[PDB]
Amino acid sequence: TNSIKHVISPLARQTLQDRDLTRPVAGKRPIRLLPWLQVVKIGGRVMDRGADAILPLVEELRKLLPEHRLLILTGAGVRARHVFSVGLDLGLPVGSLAPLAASEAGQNGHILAAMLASEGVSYVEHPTVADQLAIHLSATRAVVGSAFPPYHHHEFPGSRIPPHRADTGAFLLADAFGAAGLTIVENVDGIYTADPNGPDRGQARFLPETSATDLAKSEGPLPVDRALLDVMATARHIERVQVVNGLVPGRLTAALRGEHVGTLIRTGVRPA
């Protein structure tokens, strides 16, 4: 008289920890939810440059609205570095710093969306993106959201810096939707063998194409989250993500058409 009350289902009684028992029911590749969607991630450091960088990008995005169904996601930038400096000084854990940094990505999204409001573009919130993106992209050609994922105090421990940042959140969304692609808009041409703005910039060599697995094996700085490479290994749909220089007009437009104008990152999705 203390037995578990089960609902009859193909997964009933299972812990879901037995991968052999769950595979017949759930071991399949998922369907694409929004196969016609194009996701564009705008770097926070690009937004940090102000009107000199934002105004040309706004004009490029304006011309892209009749061409693509766009989910535009903004990164955090330098302001998240300051809340990290204050938060780490206060000793706050990584799950405390994750939502604080995400706030700066959201503010960048409001700034970018305001510049495109006359085109019908508005900032939309994470619950709206998660559940109602389809109806919002039926109302207008593009919407803006925060690229950071809502991990909050459930951010993974290990590093004192939140690992799941703007690149990672944007890819998780784009791949979960089964979007046609994700383009990362950077303040540099792409990925180099070293920081092109750091002390060893004289040794930095440009990488036109690379694997996520080879990047993950690498040590040293990257223009993308290292967690992005980890979620690329478990990707289900998106086979490549291009990092392009948003400070050069036309490269975002070219990358959305599949033209190689930056660094191509091959995910774990093996093409047929």
Partner: protein, 268 residues
């Protein structure tokens, strides 16, 4: 005159009618939280300094709440100035900048609240009317974000797109609305000076000044937002404020006990 006079005017006249306005001014004055004190923890002046400034004030807050009911509002600071710089450079209006700065004050409230969580002091989307935590001797305090809720409806300044009502006005108007007995601004200087003490070393400390005397000086810079001086003269409950140096231990505690330790700015 009478309430029957006020009720007839309220139904027959425009709210702009001077007779209606005068009749409404005769109404009783209820103070919602008369035993509470609203304090602003500085954004650029305190929280942006990090552990060396916040941790001592956290200890002082935990000790002070044994004797004083506290509504602890947070400033914004340098991250808001960066946001204001980006948005201003794009020509965005004051209403858009207002919501950007609100996020920075939200961040500071979250950081300060997590340091006070184990003492039972919560971060509130309420504060005033958050009656339970203030009611309790074990808590007796809340933390709130100091930015006003005007958002896109922010009244712009006479010149420029910087929102004229920010975290100083946000905390002060909450103190005024709930009829609190005191409003203390906790920043990083002993009080108001004749000029900005960081950029002018010939600046002199001002122990006490009225709004009229303060306006007559024609100050180029101030430790408080200038529109707050007009809100102060219009206030019904909080007719003076105190600005203290939170970097000096004990200044907040003594100010909470009613002692004049920094600058007192009076409406009259």
């Amino acid at each position: 005159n009478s309430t029957a006079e006020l009720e007839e005017l309220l139904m027959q006249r425009s709210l702009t009618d001077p007779q209606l306005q005068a009749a409404a001014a005769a109404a009783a004055d209820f103070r919602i939280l008369p035993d509470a004190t609203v304090i602003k923890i500085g954004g650029q002046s305190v929280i942006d300094r990090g552990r060396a400034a916040v941790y001592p004030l956290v200890d002082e807050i935990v000790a002070a709440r044994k004797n004083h009911k506290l509504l602890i509002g947070t400033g914004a600071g340098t991250r808001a100035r960066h946001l204001y710089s980006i948005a201003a450079g794009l020509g965005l209006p004051a209403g858009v900048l207002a919501q950007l700065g609100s996020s920075v004050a939200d961040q500071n409230a979250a950081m300060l609240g997590q340091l006070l969580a184990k003492h039972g002091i919560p971060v509130v989307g309420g504060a005033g009317l958050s009656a339970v935590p203030l009611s309790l001797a074990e808590v007796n305090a809340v933390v709130f974000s100091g930015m006003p809720p005007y958002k896109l409806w922010m009244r712009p300044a006479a010149e420029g797109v910087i929102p004229p009502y920010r975290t100083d006005a946000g905390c002060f108007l909450l103190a005024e609305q709930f009829g609190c007995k005191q409003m203390i601004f906790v920043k990083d200087e002993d009080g108001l000076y004749t000029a900005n003490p960081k950029t002018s070393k010939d600046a002199t400390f001002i122990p006490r000044i009225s709004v009229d005397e303060m306006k007559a000086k024609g100050l180029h810079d101030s430790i408080l937002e200038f529109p707050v001086l007009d809100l102060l003269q219009s206030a019904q409950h909080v007719r003076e404020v105190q600005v203290v140096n939170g970097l000096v231990p004990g200044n907040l505690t003594r100010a909470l006990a009613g002692e004049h330790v920094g600058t007192i700015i009076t409406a009259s």
